[PDB]
Amino acid sequence: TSELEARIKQFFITLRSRLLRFLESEQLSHSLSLETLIDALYKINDLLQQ
Amino acid sequence: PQMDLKVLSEYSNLRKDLILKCQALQIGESKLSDILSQTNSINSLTT
């Protein structure tokens, strides 16, 4: 059971880490960054300059 | 809207820059229409 307690504790580690790295993947696709927005605004500035 | 605070200052500076861009765009469009009407009157007089 002591060899079993390490596996079931590592199972809950590898579950919630795979869960939260999935949750941050779906959230950041529905959020915005402060780099791509500035890149798009650079493009808009270039277009309005032209 | 308006708002690592250095990139926040850079974003607000770019926002003010783009606001000045569209302001100057509207001003230049109206002034170009006025100049075009003026030179249309001048071309009518010369013809």
XYZ file of all heavy atoms in Angstrom, unseen atoms left out:
749
model
N 0.825 -1.201 0.000
C 0.000 0.000 0.000
C 0.863 1.256 0.000
O 0.438 2.307 -0.491
C -0.977 -0.017 1.183
O -1.825 1.137 1.121
C -0.256 -0.048 2.522
N 2.093 1.160 0.516
C 2.993 2.308 0.495
C 3.535 2.545 -0.906
O 3.794 3.689 -1.297
C 4.138 2.101 1.487
O 4.673 0.795 1.376
N 3.709 1.472 -1.680
C 4.012 1.631 -3.097
C 2.773 2.062 -3.867
O 2.872 2.608 -4.972
C 4.574 0.327 -3.664
N 1.594 1.825 -3.292
C 0.356 2.231 -3.942
C 0.015 3.679 -3.616
O -0.620 4.369 -4.423
C -0.776 1.300 -3.512
C -2.099 1.338 -4.270
C -2.624 -0.077 -4.412
C -3.116 2.216 -3.558
N 0.412 4.150 -2.429
C 0.075 5.509 -2.014
C 0.820 6.542 -2.847
O 0.332 7.659 -3.047
C 0.388 5.702 -0.532
C -0.695 5.210 0.411
C -2.084 5.581 -0.051
O -2.400 6.788 -0.074
O -2.857 4.663 -0.395
N 2.004 6.183 -3.345
C 2.762 7.101 -4.186
C 2.134 7.227 -5.568
O 2.169 8.302 -6.176
C 4.212 6.637 -4.297
N 1.549 6.141 -6.078
C 0.961 6.182 -7.410
C -0.340 6.970 -7.420
O -0.597 7.745 -8.348
C 0.723 4.765 -7.930
C 0.239 4.717 -9.370
C 0.415 3.332 -9.969
N 1.777 2.835 -9.802
C 2.092 1.549 -9.709
N 1.143 0.626 -9.765
N 3.359 1.185 -9.558
N -1.171 6.793 -6.390
C -2.462 7.472 -6.369
C -2.287 8.945 -6.022
O -3.129 9.780 -6.369
C -3.430 6.759 -5.406
C -2.988 6.903 -3.949
C -3.545 5.289 -5.767
C -4.049 6.488 -2.965
N -1.187 9.290 -5.353
C -0.903 10.697 -5.101
C -0.303 11.351 -6.334
O -0.551 12.530 -6.606
C 0.030 10.842 -3.901
C 0.019 12.220 -3.263
C 1.091 12.328 -2.191
C 1.385 13.775 -1.844
N 2.641 13.909 -1.053
N 0.484 10.596 -7.102
C 1.000 11.112 -8.364
C -0.085 11.139 -9.429
O 0.005 11.896 -10.402
C 2.188 10.267 -8.822
C 3.124 10.966 -9.787
C 2.823 10.618 -11.228
O 1.931 9.818 -11.513
N 3.567 11.218 -12.148
N -1.123 10.312 -9.267
C -2.237 10.337 -10.207
C -3.066 11.599 -10.040
O -3.529 12.184 -11.025
C -3.117 9.105 -10.022
C -4.429 9.192 -10.739
C -4.475 9.173 -12.124
C -5.616 9.302 -10.032
C -5.683 9.255 -12.791
C -6.825 9.385 -10.695
C -6.859 9.363 -12.076
N -3.266 12.036 -8.795
C -4.016 13.265 -8.560
C -3.196 14.487 -8.949
O -3.753 15.543 -9.275
C -4.443 13.342 -7.097
C -5.801 12.763 -6.831
C -6.152 11.525 -7.337
C -6.730 13.465 -6.079
C -7.404 10.991 -7.096
C -7.982 12.937 -5.831
C -8.320 11.700 -6.342
N -1.867 14.363 -8.921
C -1.007 15.439 -9.401
C -1.091 15.548 -10.917
O -1.288 16.638 -11.466
C 0.441 15.215 -8.921
C 0.554 15.508 -7.424
C 1.423 16.079 -9.700
C 0.189 16.923 -7.049
N -0.993 14.413 -11.615
C -0.989 14.452 -13.075
C -2.388 14.679 -13.634
O -2.545 14.946 -14.831
C -0.379 13.166 -13.638
O -0.073 13.351 -15.026
C -1.335 11.996 -13.494
N -3.417 14.589 -12.789
C -4.764 14.885 -13.258
C -5.051 16.378 -13.203
O -5.458 16.970 -14.209
C -5.795 14.120 -12.432
C -7.235 14.303 -12.908
C -7.422 13.669 -14.274
C -8.213 13.727 -11.904
N -4.842 17.002 -12.038
C -5.160 18.418 -11.878
C -4.218 19.307 -12.678
O -4.607 20.406 -13.085
C -5.104 18.810 -10.401
C -6.027 18.021 -9.496
C -5.543 18.093 -8.057
N -6.420 17.384 -7.136
C -6.209 17.291 -5.829
N -5.145 17.865 -5.288
N -7.059 16.627 -5.061
N -2.986 18.854 -12.908
C -2.071 19.625 -13.741
C -2.478 19.555 -15.204
O -2.381 20.552 -15.928
C -0.642 19.119 -13.556
O -0.604 17.706 -13.584
N -2.940 18.389 -15.657
C -3.472 18.292 -17.011
C -4.830 18.971 -17.112
O -5.222 19.434 -18.187
C -3.568 16.827 -17.431
C -3.642 16.621 -18.935
C -3.790 15.150 -19.279
N -4.716 14.470 -18.380
C -6.026 14.382 -18.585
N -6.568 14.932 -19.661
N -6.792 13.744 -17.712
N -5.559 19.043 -15.997
C -6.845 19.728 -16.004
C -6.669 21.238 -16.086
O -7.349 21.908 -16.872
C -7.642 19.354 -14.758
C -9.137 19.652 -14.798
C -9.823 18.728 -15.781
C -9.743 19.510 -13.417
N -5.751 21.790 -15.290
C -5.604 23.241 -15.237
C -4.866 23.766 -16.460
O -5.076 24.911 -16.874
C -4.885 23.651 -13.955
C -5.147 25.088 -13.507
C -6.624 25.280 -13.218
C -4.311 25.429 -12.287
N -3.998 22.946 -17.058
C -3.374 23.347 -18.312
C -4.349 23.226 -19.477
O -4.113 23.806 -20.541
C -2.113 22.521 -18.570
C -2.355 21.178 -19.239
C -1.049 20.475 -19.563
N -0.552 19.688 -18.438
C 0.424 20.081 -17.627
N 1.010 21.255 -17.810
N 0.813 19.300 -16.630
N -5.440 22.480 -19.296
C -6.524 22.520 -20.270
C -7.403 23.739 -20.044
O -7.891 24.350 -21.003
C -7.348 21.236 -20.194
C -8.734 21.368 -20.762
C -8.925 21.488 -22.131
C -9.843 21.371 -19.931
C -10.198 21.614 -22.661
C -11.119 21.497 -20.453
C -11.295 21.617 -21.821
N -7.610 24.109 -18.778
C -8.488 25.227 -18.456
C -7.871 26.554 -18.875
O -8.586 27.476 -19.284
C -8.797 25.227 -16.962
C -10.170 25.746 -16.537
C -11.262 24.836 -17.060
C -10.244 25.853 -15.025
N -6.546 26.668 -18.794
C -5.886 27.895 -19.222
C -5.756 27.952 -20.736
O -5.494 29.018 -21.305
C -4.515 28.016 -18.561
N -5.921 26.812 -21.410
C -5.891 26.813 -22.869
C -7.203 27.326 -23.445
O -7.206 28.070 -24.431
C -5.592 25.409 -23.388
O -5.611 25.380 -24.803
N -8.327 26.941 -22.841
C -9.621 27.399 -23.339
C -9.895 28.834 -22.916
O -10.600 29.569 -23.619
C -10.730 26.473 -22.841
N -9.345 29.254 -21.776
C -9.588 30.608 -21.291
C -8.808 31.635 -22.103
O -9.359 32.671 -22.494
C -9.226 30.699 -19.810
C -9.195 32.110 -19.252
C -10.496 32.847 -19.473
O -10.515 33.930 -20.055
N -11.591 32.260 -19.017
N -7.530 31.360 -22.373
C -6.694 32.310 -23.102
C -7.073 32.410 -24.572
O -6.732 33.406 -25.217
C -5.218 31.934 -22.970
C -4.401 32.595 -21.851
C -4.377 34.104 -22.032
C -4.905 32.228 -20.462
N -7.768 31.411 -25.113
C -8.321 31.548 -26.455
C -9.551 32.442 -26.462
O -9.939 32.944 -27.524
C -8.672 30.177 -27.027
O -9.631 30.297 -28.064
N -10.174 32.646 -25.306
C -11.308 33.547 -25.173
C -10.941 34.843 -24.465
O -11.832 35.629 -24.124
C -12.449 32.850 -24.436
C -13.805 33.307 -24.865
N -14.333 34.523 -24.486
C -14.736 32.723 -25.656
C -15.535 34.663 -25.016
N -15.803 33.585 -25.732
N -9.655 35.082 -24.228
C -9.164 36.327 -23.662
C -8.223 36.978 -24.665
O -8.062 36.506 -25.795
C -8.453 36.089 -22.329
N -7.592 38.071 -24.251
C -6.682 38.810 -25.112
C -5.328 38.968 -24.436
O -5.207 38.877 -23.212
C -7.238 40.190 -25.474
C -8.163 40.267 -26.689
C -9.583 39.834 -26.352
C -8.150 41.665 -27.284
N -4.308 39.198 -25.255
C -2.963 39.443 -24.760
C -2.644 40.929 -24.890
O -3.408 41.708 -25.465
C -1.957 38.583 -25.516
O -1.861 38.994 -26.867
N -1.500 41.341 -24.355
C -1.029 42.714 -24.477
C 0.130 42.807 -25.459
O 0.920 43.751 -25.413
C -0.628 43.286 -23.118
C -1.688 44.010 -22.279
C -2.198 45.236 -23.026
C -2.842 43.108 -21.856
N 0.255 41.821 -26.335
C 1.255 41.845 -27.394
C 0.645 41.787 -28.782
O 0.996 42.604 -29.643
C 2.238 40.678 -27.216
N -0.274 40.848 -29.019
C -0.954 40.771 -30.307
C -1.861 41.971 -30.532
O -2.025 42.415 -31.675
C -1.760 39.476 -30.397
O -2.442 39.255 -29.155
C -0.841 38.300 -30.672
N -2.436 42.514 -29.457
C -3.234 43.729 -29.562
C -2.378 44.914 -29.986
O -2.780 45.704 -30.846
C -3.925 44.009 -28.229
C -4.470 45.415 -27.992
C -5.682 45.670 -28.861
C -4.813 45.603 -26.530
N -1.174 45.025 -29.421
C -0.268 46.108 -29.792
C 0.248 45.910 -31.213
O 0.458 46.880 -31.951
C 0.874 46.207 -28.763
C 0.292 46.325 -27.355
C 1.771 47.404 -29.036
C -0.539 47.571 -27.139
N 0.413 44.653 -31.638
C 0.810 44.380 -33.019
C -0.287 44.773 -34.004
O -0.008 45.373 -35.055
C 1.166 42.903 -33.177
N -1.541 44.460 -33.670
C -2.662 44.849 -34.520
C -2.828 46.362 -34.551
O -3.158 46.938 -35.593
C -3.943 44.175 -34.039
N -2.570 47.025 -33.421
C -2.643 48.481 -33.402
C -1.485 49.110 -34.170
O -1.652 50.188 -34.751
C -2.680 48.983 -31.963
C -4.002 48.759 -31.223
C -4.004 49.485 -29.892
C -5.192 49.184 -32.069
N -0.323 48.451 -34.198
C 0.768 48.882 -35.070
C 0.369 48.785 -36.534
O 0.672 49.685 -37.332
C 2.016 48.035 -34.813
C 2.833 48.441 -33.609
C 3.740 47.558 -33.036
C 2.705 49.706 -33.047
C 4.496 47.920 -31.937
C 3.459 50.078 -31.948
C 4.350 49.182 -31.398
O 5.096 49.550 -30.303
N -0.319 47.700 -36.900
C -0.803 47.547 -38.270
C -1.830 48.620 -38.620
O -1.788 49.193 -39.716
C -1.400 46.154 -38.459
C -0.372 45.043 -38.506
C -0.996 43.737 -38.954
C -1.373 43.779 -40.423
N -2.065 42.531 -40.845
N -2.736 48.919 -37.685
C -3.742 49.958 -37.888
C -3.088 51.331 -38.013
O -3.495 52.150 -38.852
C -4.772 49.898 -36.742
C -5.635 48.646 -36.877
C -5.675 51.116 -36.719
C -6.312 48.239 -35.592
N -2.039 51.585 -37.222
C -1.291 52.833 -37.319
C -0.592 52.963 -38.664
O -0.560 54.053 -39.246
C -0.275 52.918 -36.182
C 0.353 54.292 -36.065
O -0.170 55.275 -36.590
N 1.486 54.364 -35.378
N -0.046 51.857 -39.180
C 0.579 51.882 -40.501
C -0.442 52.159 -41.599
O -0.171 52.939 -42.524
C 1.297 50.559 -40.763
N -1.629 51.554 -41.491
C -2.668 51.762 -42.498
C -3.179 53.199 -42.483
O -3.374 53.811 -43.543
C -3.824 50.788 -42.276
C -3.584 49.283 -42.445
C -4.892 48.576 -42.739
C -2.543 48.968 -43.518
N -3.381 53.759 -41.290
C -3.849 55.136 -41.217
C -2.757 56.123 -41.605
O -3.058 57.194 -42.145
C -4.386 55.437 -39.821
C -5.672 54.680 -39.489
C -6.202 55.071 -38.129
C -6.717 54.925 -40.551
N -1.488 55.770 -41.374
C -0.393 56.597 -41.862
C -0.351 56.606 -43.384
O -0.093 57.646 -43.995
C 0.930 56.096 -41.289
C 2.117 57.002 -41.568
C 1.956 58.380 -40.956
O 1.616 59.340 -41.645
N 2.208 58.483 -39.657
N -0.643 55.463 -44.014
C -0.679 55.422 -45.474
C -1.867 56.205 -46.030
O -1.748 56.869 -47.073
C -0.722 53.976 -45.955
C -0.531 53.841 -47.448
C -0.597 52.410 -47.920
O -0.525 51.474 -47.124
N -0.746 52.231 -49.226
N -11.149 51.200 -24.581
C -10.965 51.932 -23.328
C -9.502 52.308 -23.113
O -8.634 52.065 -23.949
C -11.442 50.933 -22.273
C -11.115 49.612 -22.866
C -11.329 49.755 -24.350
N -9.249 52.911 -21.962
C -7.929 53.357 -21.552
C -7.534 52.661 -20.255
O -8.376 52.183 -19.492
C -7.914 54.879 -21.408
C -8.948 55.412 -20.435
C -9.121 56.914 -20.535
O -8.425 57.581 -21.299
N -10.060 57.455 -19.770
N -6.229 52.606 -20.010
C -5.701 51.921 -18.838
C -4.839 52.848 -17.988
O -4.511 52.534 -16.845
C -4.893 50.695 -19.258
C -5.735 49.556 -19.797
S -7.143 49.183 -18.739
C -7.232 47.404 -18.913
N 4.876 46.031 -14.876
C 4.588 46.068 -16.306
C 3.770 47.295 -16.712
O 2.991 47.243 -17.661
C 3.880 44.774 -16.737
C 2.672 44.427 -15.864
O 2.186 45.279 -15.092
O 2.203 43.273 -15.959
N 3.960 48.398 -15.985
C 3.217 49.616 -16.290
C 3.833 50.374 -17.459
O 3.215 51.310 -17.979
C 3.128 50.520 -15.055
C 4.324 51.360 -14.590
C 3.832 52.481 -13.689
C 5.370 50.536 -13.852
N 5.038 49.986 -17.886
C 5.658 50.632 -19.037
C 4.941 50.272 -20.333
O 4.759 51.136 -21.199
C 7.139 50.261 -19.119
C 7.434 48.790 -18.889
C 8.898 48.481 -19.125
C 9.143 46.985 -19.135
N 8.460 46.324 -20.280
N 4.495 49.022 -20.474
C 3.735 48.656 -21.666
C 2.325 49.230 -21.588
O 1.690 49.481 -22.617
C 3.753 47.126 -21.871
C 2.810 46.404 -20.909
C 3.439 46.769 -23.321
N 1.843 49.517 -20.374
C 0.577 50.224 -20.221
C 0.705 51.672 -20.680
O -0.185 52.201 -21.359
C 0.118 50.139 -18.764
C -1.272 50.604 -18.324
C -1.761 49.712 -17.202
C -1.276 52.052 -17.851
N 1.818 52.323 -20.322
C 2.092 53.670 -20.811
C 2.292 53.691 -22.322
O 1.837 54.624 -22.993
C 3.319 54.248 -20.109
O 3.767 55.427 -20.754
N 2.936 52.656 -22.868
C 3.110 52.552 -24.313
C 1.776 52.336 -25.023
O 1.547 52.892 -26.103
C 4.088 51.421 -24.629
C 4.606 51.400 -26.057
C 4.041 50.248 -26.864
O 3.582 49.262 -26.249
O 4.067 50.324 -28.110
N 0.878 51.559 -24.410
C -0.448 51.349 -24.978
C -1.271 52.630 -24.952
O -1.981 52.930 -25.917
C -1.174 50.233 -24.222
C -2.686 50.331 -24.253
C -3.402 49.994 -25.397
C -3.400 50.742 -23.130
C -4.782 50.079 -25.427
C -4.779 50.829 -23.153
C -5.464 50.495 -24.304
O -6.837 50.579 -24.329
N -1.192 53.394 -23.858
C -1.935 54.650 -23.800
C -1.354 55.682 -24.761
O -2.098 56.476 -25.351
C -1.947 55.194 -22.372
O -0.656 55.149 -21.806
N -0.030 55.660 -24.954
C 0.596 56.541 -25.934
C 0.176 56.178 -27.353
O -0.110 57.065 -28.166
C 2.117 56.475 -25.794
C 2.792 57.774 -26.174
O 2.490 58.365 -27.210
N 3.710 58.230 -25.331
N 0.104 54.880 -27.655
C -0.355 54.448 -28.971
C -1.833 54.750 -29.170
O -2.265 55.061 -30.284
C -0.080 52.958 -29.153
C 0.209 52.518 -30.585
C 1.534 53.086 -31.053
C 0.206 51.008 -30.674
N -2.620 54.681 -28.094
C -4.035 55.031 -28.171
C -4.217 56.511 -28.471
O -5.035 56.880 -29.325
C -4.722 54.643 -26.864
C -6.057 55.312 -26.612
C -6.597 54.903 -25.256
N -8.000 55.268 -25.093
C -8.412 56.406 -24.549
N -7.525 57.289 -24.111
N -9.707 56.658 -24.435
N -3.431 57.368 -27.808
C -3.462 58.800 -28.103
C -2.975 59.085 -29.517
O -3.506 59.974 -30.198
C -2.621 59.564 -27.084
C -2.863 61.063 -27.091
C -2.070 61.761 -26.001
C -0.646 62.046 -26.449
N 0.028 63.041 -25.569
N -1.992 58.311 -29.988
C -1.490 58.472 -31.349
C -2.552 58.116 -32.385
O -2.740 58.849 -33.356
C -0.240 57.616 -31.548
N -3.279 57.014 -32.173
C -4.315 56.618 -33.125
C -5.517 57.557 -33.072
O -6.178 57.790 -34.095
C -4.745 55.174 -32.864
C -4.023 54.042 -33.610
C -4.255 54.184 -35.093
C -2.534 53.955 -33.334
N -5.805 58.113 -31.891
C -6.852 59.125 -31.773
C -6.476 60.375 -32.564
O -7.300 60.934 -33.307
C -7.111 59.428 -30.287
C -7.978 58.332 -29.676
C -7.780 60.773 -30.097
C -8.094 58.421 -28.176
N -5.213 60.798 -32.460
C -4.725 61.913 -33.267
C -4.733 61.579 -34.754
O -4.988 62.464 -35.581
C -3.319 62.299 -32.817
C -3.175 63.500 -31.881
C -3.949 63.303 -30.589
C -1.708 63.745 -31.583
N -4.491 60.306 -35.099
C -4.538 59.865 -36.492
C -5.928 60.043 -37.088
O -6.077 60.641 -38.160
C -4.123 58.398 -36.605
C -2.639 58.105 -36.492
C -1.802 58.989 -37.381
C -0.353 58.531 -37.377
N 0.583 59.638 -37.032
N -6.963 59.542 -36.403
C -8.304 59.639 -36.978
C -8.833 61.070 -36.922
O -9.605 61.484 -37.802
C -9.267 58.672 -36.291
S -9.283 58.706 -34.502
N -8.398 61.847 -35.921
C -8.734 63.267 -35.867
C -8.177 64.014 -37.073
O -8.906 64.749 -37.759
C -8.188 63.876 -34.577
C -9.138 63.842 -33.406
C -8.569 64.551 -32.198
O -7.407 64.360 -31.843
N -9.381 65.390 -31.567
N -6.885 63.819 -37.353
C -6.265 64.448 -38.511
C -6.843 63.922 -39.814
O -6.900 64.664 -40.798
C -4.755 64.233 -38.474
N -7.310 62.670 -39.825
C -7.936 62.117 -41.023
C -9.247 62.828 -41.339
O -9.491 63.200 -42.493
C -8.162 60.617 -40.837
C -8.340 59.739 -42.079
C -7.724 58.379 -41.827
C -9.800 59.581 -42.475
N -10.090 63.036 -40.320
C -11.350 63.749 -40.533
C -11.113 65.203 -40.926
O -11.794 65.731 -41.821
C -12.211 63.684 -39.275
C -12.648 62.288 -38.898
C -13.252 62.230 -37.512
O -13.349 61.163 -36.910
N -13.665 63.382 -36.996
N -10.137 65.853 -40.276
C -9.807 67.242 -40.590
C -9.306 67.364 -42.024
O -9.735 68.253 -42.775
C -8.780 67.782 -39.579
C -9.434 67.979 -38.215
C -8.181 69.093 -40.045
C -8.451 68.015 -37.069
N -8.438 66.441 -42.441
C -7.908 66.485 -43.789
C -8.949 66.168 -44.842
O -8.920 66.738 -45.933
N -9.903 65.289 -44.521
C -10.972 64.984 -45.467
C -11.882 66.186 -45.688
O -12.203 66.526 -46.837
C -11.781 63.785 -44.977
N -12.278 66.862 -44.602
C -13.128 68.042 -44.744
C -12.393 69.182 -45.444
O -12.966 69.867 -46.308
C -13.637 68.492 -43.377
O -14.012 69.856 -43.398
N -11.111 69.372 -45.115
C -10.339 70.422 -45.766
C -10.094 70.112 -47.234
O -10.113 71.024 -48.063
C -9.018 70.634 -45.027
C -8.263 71.881 -45.450
C -9.138 73.118 -45.359
C -9.354 73.546 -43.919
N -8.157 74.227 -43.365
N -9.921 68.833 -47.581
C -9.740 68.453 -48.978
C -11.016 68.673 -49.772
O -10.957 69.070 -50.941
C -9.282 66.995 -49.057
C -8.814 66.380 -50.380
C -7.713 65.382 -50.087
C -9.942 65.673 -51.119
N -12.176 68.429 -49.153
C -13.442 68.736 -49.818
C -13.597 70.236 -50.055
O -14.070 70.655 -51.123
C -14.614 68.207 -49.001
O -15.807 68.887 -49.349
N -13.183 71.054 -49.081
C -13.246 72.506 -49.256
C -12.309 72.984 -50.366
O -12.693 73.828 -51.191
C -12.913 73.204 -47.939
N -11.094 72.432 -50.416
C -10.130 72.789 -51.455
C -10.628 72.344 -52.825
O -10.462 73.057 -53.824
C -8.752 72.189 -51.117
C -8.186 72.835 -49.852
C -7.761 72.370 -52.258
C -6.771 72.403 -49.511
N -11.288 71.184 -52.888
C -11.804 70.687 -54.157
C -12.949 71.557 -54.662
O -13.038 71.823 -55.866
C -12.238 69.229 -54.007
C -12.542 68.373 -55.243
C -12.129 66.938 -54.965
C -14.016 68.405 -55.646
N -13.809 72.035 -53.756
C -14.862 72.964 -54.163
C -14.281 74.292 -54.643
O -14.754 74.865 -55.638
C -15.825 73.202 -53.004
O -15.358 74.255 -52.180
N -13.235 74.772 -53.962
C -12.588 76.026 -54.340
C -11.947 75.931 -55.725
O -12.150 76.803 -56.582
C -11.553 76.388 -53.279
C -10.857 77.713 -53.474
C -9.924 78.021 -52.320
O -9.802 77.235 -51.383
N -9.251 79.163 -52.389
N -11.200 74.855 -55.976
C -10.577 74.709 -57.285
C -11.583 74.337 -58.367
O -11.325 74.610 -59.541
C -9.432 73.689 -57.244
O -8.732 73.714 -58.493
C -9.940 72.284 -57.000
N -12.742 73.774 -58.001
C -13.797 73.575 -58.987
C -14.386 74.906 -59.427
O -14.653 75.111 -60.620
C -14.884 72.668 -58.417
C -16.081 72.541 -59.336
O -17.079 73.242 -59.176
N -15.985 71.640 -60.308
N -14.568 75.829 -58.478
C -14.995 77.181 -58.832
C -13.955 77.903 -59.687
O -14.313 78.607 -60.642
C -15.284 77.977 -57.564
O -14.111 78.111 -56.784
N -12.671 77.700 -59.380
C -11.600 78.327 -60.157
C -11.558 77.767 -61.578
O -11.405 78.519 -62.552
C -10.260 78.149 -59.419
C -10.233 79.026 -58.170
C -9.078 78.503 -60.306
C -10.527 80.482 -58.450
N -11.723 76.447 -61.719
C -11.753 75.826 -63.040
C -12.966 76.265 -63.844
O -12.860 76.443 -65.063
C -11.739 74.306 -62.907
C -10.353 73.763 -62.662
O -9.382 74.515 -62.598
N -10.251 72.447 -62.519
N -14.110 76.467 -63.178
C -15.288 76.984 -63.866
C -15.053 78.400 -64.376
O -15.431 78.724 -65.510
C -16.500 76.951 -62.942
O -16.301 77.794 -61.823
N -14.396 79.241 -63.567
C -14.096 80.604 -64.002
C -13.120 80.624 -65.176
O -13.316 81.379 -66.142
C -13.533 81.418 -62.835
C -13.076 82.833 -63.200
C -14.231 83.818 -63.130
C -11.916 83.280 -62.329
N -12.078 79.790 -65.123
C -11.088 79.781 -66.196
C -11.664 79.213 -67.488
O -11.364 79.715 -68.576
C -9.847 78.994 -65.779
O -10.234 77.695 -65.318
C -9.107 79.721 -64.676
N -12.521 78.192 -67.392
C -13.155 77.666 -68.595
C -14.170 78.651 -69.162
O -14.330 78.745 -70.385
C -13.817 76.323 -68.306
O -14.492 76.385 -67.044
C -12.773 75.220 -68.265
